[PDB]
Amino acid sequence: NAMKIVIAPDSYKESLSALEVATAIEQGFREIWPDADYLKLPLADGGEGTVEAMVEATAGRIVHVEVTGPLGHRVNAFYGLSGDARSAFIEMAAASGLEQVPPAQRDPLKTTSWGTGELIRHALDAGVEHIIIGIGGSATNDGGAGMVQALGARLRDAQGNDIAQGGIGLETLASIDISGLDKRLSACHIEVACDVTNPLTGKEGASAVFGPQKGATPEMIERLDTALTRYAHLIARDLHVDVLDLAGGGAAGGMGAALYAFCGAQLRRGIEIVTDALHLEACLADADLVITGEGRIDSQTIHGKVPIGVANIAKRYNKPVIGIAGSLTAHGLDAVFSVIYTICTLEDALKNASENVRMTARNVAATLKAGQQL
Amino acid sequence: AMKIVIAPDSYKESLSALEVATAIEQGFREIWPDADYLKLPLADGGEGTVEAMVEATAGRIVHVEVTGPLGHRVNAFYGLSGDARSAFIEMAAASGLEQVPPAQRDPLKTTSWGTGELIRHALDAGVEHIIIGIGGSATNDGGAGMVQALGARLRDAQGNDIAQGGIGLETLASIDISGLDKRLSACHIEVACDVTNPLTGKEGASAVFGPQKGATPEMIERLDTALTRYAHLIARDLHVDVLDLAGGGAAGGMGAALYAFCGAQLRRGIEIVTDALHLEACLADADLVITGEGRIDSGKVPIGVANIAKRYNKPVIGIAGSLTHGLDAVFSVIYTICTLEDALKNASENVRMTARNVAATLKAGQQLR
Ligand SMILES: [Cl-]
Numbered sequence A: 001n002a003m004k005i006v007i008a009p010d011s012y013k014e015s016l017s018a019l020e021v022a023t024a025i026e027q028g029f030r031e032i033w034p035d036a037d038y039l040k041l042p043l044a045d046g047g048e049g050t051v052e053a054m055v056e057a058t059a060g061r062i063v064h065v066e067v068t069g070p071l072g073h074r075v076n077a078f079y080g081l082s083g084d085a086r087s088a089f090i091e092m093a094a095a096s097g098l099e100q101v102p103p104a105q106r107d108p109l110k111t112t113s114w115g116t117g118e119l120i121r122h123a124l125d126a127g128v129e130h131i132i133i134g135i136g137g138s139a140t141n142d143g144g145a146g147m148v149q150a151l152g153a154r155l156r157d158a159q160g161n162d163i164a165q166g167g168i169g170l171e172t173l174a175s176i177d178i179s180g181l182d183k184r185l186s187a188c189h190i191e192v193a194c195d196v197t198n199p200l201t202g203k204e205g206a207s208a209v210f211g212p213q214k215g216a217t218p219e220m221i222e223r224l225d226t227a228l229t230r231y232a233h234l235i236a237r238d239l240h241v242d243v244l245d246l247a248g249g250g251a252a253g254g255m256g257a258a259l260y261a262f263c264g265a266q267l268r269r270g271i272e273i274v275t276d277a278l279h280l281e282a283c284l285a286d287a288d289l290v291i292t293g294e295g296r297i298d299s300q301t302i303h304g305k306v307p308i309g310v311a312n313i314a315k316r317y318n319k320p321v322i323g324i325a326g327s328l329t330a331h332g333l334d335a336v337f338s339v340i341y342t343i344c345t346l347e348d349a350l351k352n353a354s355e356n357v358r359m360t361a362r363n364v365a366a367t368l369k370a371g372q373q374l
Numbered sequence B: 001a002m003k004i005v006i007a008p009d010s011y012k013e014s015l016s017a018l019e020v021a022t023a024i025e026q027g028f029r030e031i032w033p034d035a036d037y038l039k040l041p042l043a044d045g046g047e048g049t050v051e052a053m054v055e056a057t058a059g060r061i062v063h064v065e066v067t068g069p070l071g072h073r074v075n076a077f078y079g080l081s082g083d084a085r086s087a088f089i090e091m092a093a094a095s096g097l098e099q100v101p102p103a104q105r106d107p108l109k110t111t112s113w114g115t116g117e118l119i120r121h122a123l124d125a126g127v128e129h130i131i132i133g134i135g136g137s138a139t140n141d142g143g144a145g146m147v148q149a150l151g152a153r154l155r156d157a158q159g160n161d162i163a164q165g166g167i168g169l170e171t172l173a174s175i176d177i178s179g180l181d182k183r184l185s186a187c188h189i190e191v192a193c194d195v196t197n198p199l200t201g202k203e204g205a206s207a208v209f210g211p212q213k214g215a216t217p218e219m220i221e222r223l224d225t226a227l228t229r230y231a232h233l234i235a236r237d238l239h240v241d242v243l244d245l246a247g248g249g250a251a252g253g254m255g256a257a258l259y260a261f262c263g264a265q266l267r268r269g270i271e272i273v274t275d276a277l278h279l280e281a282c283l284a285d286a287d288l289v290i291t292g293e294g295r296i297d298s299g300k301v302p303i304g305v306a307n308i309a310k311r312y313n314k315p316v317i318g319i320a321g322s323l324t325h326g327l328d329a330v331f332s333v334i335y336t337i338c339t340l341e342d343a344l345k346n347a348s349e350n351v352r353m354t355a356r357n358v359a360a361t362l363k364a365g366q367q368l369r
Helices: A020-030 A050-055 A115-124 A145-150 A207-212 A217-237 A251-263 A271-276 A279-287 A305-316 A348-372 B017-029 B049-057 B113-124 B142-151 B205-209 B217-237 B250-262 B269-276 B280-284 B300-311 B343-366
Strands: A002-007 A037-040 A061-068 A076-081 A087-091 A128-136 A152-157 A175-177 A188-193 A265-269 A291-296 A319-329 A335-340 B004-005 B036-039 B060-067 B073-080 B084-089 B128-132 B151-155 B174-176 B188-192 B265-267 B288-295 B316-320 B331-336
Touching: A002 A020, A020 A037, A020 A050, A020 A348, A050 A061, A050 A076, A050 A087, A050 A188, A050 A271, A050 B084, A061 B269, A076 A115, A087 A115, A115 A128, A115 A145, A115 B217, A128 A271, A128 A335, A145 A152, A145 A251, A145 B128, A175 A217, A188 A251, A188 A271, A207 A217, A217 A251, A251 A265, A251 B205, A265 A271, A271 A305, A279 A305, A291 A348, A305 A319, A305 B004, A319 A348, A335 A348, A335 B004, A348 B331, A348 B343, B004 B113, B004 B280, B017 B036, B017 B049, B017 B188, B017 B288, B017 B316, B017 B343, B049 B073, B049 B084, B049 B128, B049 B269, B060 B113, B084 B113, B113 B128, B113 B142, B128 B269, B142 B151, B142 B250, B174 B217, B174 B343, B188 B250, B188 B269, B205 B217, B217 B250, B250 B265, B265 B269, B269 B280, B269 B300, B280 B300, B288 B300, B300 B316, B316 B343
Parallel strands: A002 A037, A002 A291, A087 A128, A128 A188, A188 A265, A291 A319, A319 A335, B004 B036, B004 B288, B084 B128, B128 B188, B188 B265, B288 B316, B316 B331
Antiparallel strands: A061 A076, A076 A087, A152 A175, B060 B073, B073 B084, B151 B174
């Protein structure tokens, strides 16, 4: 009988995690409806915070582990494992991301994805049947060549020499050999959060569109673009997979195409991966009311990926859905209310972000109650 | 049909009470097109009370020229009701601090003559009822200019009409209300008065409100002596104790002169406006009350509304503007001052969108069984 209220928000970036957002909403709602049946389900879009969100949702753990970082030195990375141990959650950026690289050291000719392969290997080592991988924020333009080598593939040059680390090495590539390739991979269900359509090569390929932001000069870009062409050609030829035409294969320096061609990964929109994995639809089918939201700081990246995906599912069950949306200044949702917040370089500001979500949530609930009485 | 009353105050430096009410109704109609809406722009007796009352009563604004606070000609205004039975006056239009540049602020010289004129013109339209707000005064003359403009003869020891301003009060020797417009006692005159301060003393007009009107400490002492006298002469010649009036110090002592000379009632501004628009009958009949206000600083209207509403067990939601008790829920809108080109438009849009989401939320709650 108790009213069932599902609270499935994204994070407020640079401030509250998805779960802290859900918790502040629940506290506000409980001021009006102390005895409702609340189900919190912290969501993510496959980007930053996905591993933590997934681990919370699944009662899992974060496993910290030393891997090879993007410049080939030892870095501390992490992956997540589900409560049941059947799923691993990986953000490649922990091993191979731009922020593992101090500004006066970005060379996308040298940077490697090796440590992403190590994270995948450790996940596989833990017995998982399912891996979810986020590939945003990459330092690498090596087409995932480091990654697949770390997993057992031999990527050699014309004289049988393993290729050099980074995109540099891919120019020299003569034979892909997957006799050594970790056999647990094709048995595994591997999903990659991929929200771009860019292919491996060309004028909207990996090097052209994303190489600049990893520090490629105009000329470095042609070299890498020309090398990923060869890569695709040696992929089609030595793996018998066509990767040149794949939508999203140009993601994370071409790692999208390596994850597809070597690992049997599926490239899917991240919100759909996360939505399926946490069984949102099953949680919602029952609900009376769905509350969601998200917070963005930068106005370019204000994309309601989580609220809209939540609303799309809810509408199939005709559930009312209300969003509490965070912004610096102030789509299937029945209503959206805004919360102004800032970047948390006080922690006092973390508390104020918490308080403003809670208080808005209170007023939303009070207004729902007022509606009942009409 | 659902009855929805929209009864907000203005957003200061932004949307008028009516413009708030219009933005709210627009957003609500996006969810509930066919409900019954009533916009009642409200005011607390302060800035914007004449304009809100005209709108709320389908009346009109009358522009007329009067004597400003330093004696010069100013274009003041007032409001008549739709039935032409009530006048709405803001003193400040005639005798306000906005009419006096900061450099030229002298509470020894400033006159309320202009205010008396406004009142005379309202009496001239045969109104039975006058609502006067007395905020933002430049004057510390005890309403002496005002009443002299209404025919009261206030003169020194030689029969000479006293000079303009509270400095004229130092020589006041006799009050004669024989020329005093006979239409005043007849008139139901209500004065928005929301401070308890009396005419004279430590918490009197001059001590408490003088300084902001340019009163120096030395000036404050002169004026307080002169108003103390005025007060004694009022008791002697009009047989009325203004010396003990809560609110007599309002508007440099104008509250006491409206009480004593005019027969006016001093009431809380919100309580005058309530009765005038029959807010209690509108609300008793409503299903749903929406209110609000906007402030630029660090709310009598929303609380006044919610207090009535809750008496009839009506849901009340506020939509509150800003730059950075009895309500079921309140939601905030950020606005900017309206000197920027799109500031008014953006504020109106933000109110509208918020109201839509309030309406949509109320609707979802309806279907929560
Ligand atoms: Cl490194």
